[PDB]
């Protein structure tokens, strides 16, 4: 699997990309299965672009899984 | 604390600093206590310079934790 804390998001990548590439890696890694979600969502707010961790930023305290974040920037395009 | 996600060992910096700094900025984030030392064994693997991570995978399976994998490095300076 590709080498998960190397995957930012480029400039010609949605977030959702970087999201689906992220999240692949981490699933192929050594990581135990329950470091994956913390990891992932620590890389969402620090490898993301700007604009993005700036939104997310936003997202209520309630909202705490991976799939709560995609769906919150998503729905905000 | 610093984005542990992001830091990389520079083309100035010694292996130790980089591993410093990582575990520093790790142990200050929010990650479980219980992902810590994985996350840092995939960062020292991934993240560091190319002729170290190449140091680092001739490492006996033995050695899994962060001390024995800088002491395995520093010792072979």
């Known amino acids: 699997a590709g080498p998960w804390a190397d995957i930012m998001q480029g400039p010609s990548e949605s977030f959702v990309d970087f999201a689906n590439r ?10 135990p299965p329950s470091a ?33 974040i995609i769906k919150y920037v998503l729905d905000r395009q």
Chains 1, 2 share one sequence.
């Open 22 to 31: 992220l999240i692949k890696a981490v699933e192929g890694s050594d990581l």
């Open 36 to 68: 994956r979600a913390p990891v992932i969502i620590d890389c969402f707010r620090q490898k993301s672009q700007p604009d993005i961790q700036q939104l997310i930023r936003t997202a209520p305290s309630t909202l705490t899984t991976p799939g709560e």
